[PDB]
């Protein structure tokens, strides 16, 4: 998936999950950026499903 909006440490990312149900299934997951930058799925953004 692709960073959609970039704040300082958070980032809204996109094009990866299809629905908020899938986000909620993976809502604590270790996500990773190929720069070697770890991160965590926090919460499903509401309107950009």
């Amino acid at each position: 998936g692709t960073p959609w909006k970039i704040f300082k440490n958070t980032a809204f990312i996109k094009d990866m999950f299809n629905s908020s149900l899938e986000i909620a299934k993976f809502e604590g997951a270790a996500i990773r950026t190929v720069s070697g930058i770890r991160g965590q799925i926090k919460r499903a953004l509401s309107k950009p499903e």
Binding site: S20, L21, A24, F26, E27, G28
Partner: peptide, 23 residues
């Protein structure tokens, strides 16, 4: 009509099941 309320309560209930299973 009053089917969207059923969609929202079923959707949020399914989110409760998925979040309890996730944690």
């Amino acid at each position: 009509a009053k089917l969207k309320a059923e969609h929202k309560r079923e959707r949020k209930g399914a989110l409760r099941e998925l979040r309890k299973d996730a944690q």
